[PDB]
Amino acid sequence: GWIFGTTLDSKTQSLLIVNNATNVVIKVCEFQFCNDPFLDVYANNCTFEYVSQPFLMKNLREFVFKNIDGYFK
């Protein structure tokens, strides 16, 4: 899970990444959050959607993320 944005309690479209063993959902919308942002195991201006490959496959995963000129690398 990775959350990119300015404000969490609405007021700003927030980039949202959900990673598991099945699919990666890349989404920049408003959505509703509590005070504890977490994913459970057992809205107004929603614009951006994307579906990509799962990122994951003595275990270090060096990750570097870049946000330059509106592009995510």
């Binding site: 609405s10 007021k11 700003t12 479209q13 000129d69 509106g70």
Partner: peptide, 12 residues
Amino acid sequence: LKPFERDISTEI
């Protein structure tokens, strides 16, 4: 404003 930036919410 940064380039390629879009604003939706309106504030006073």
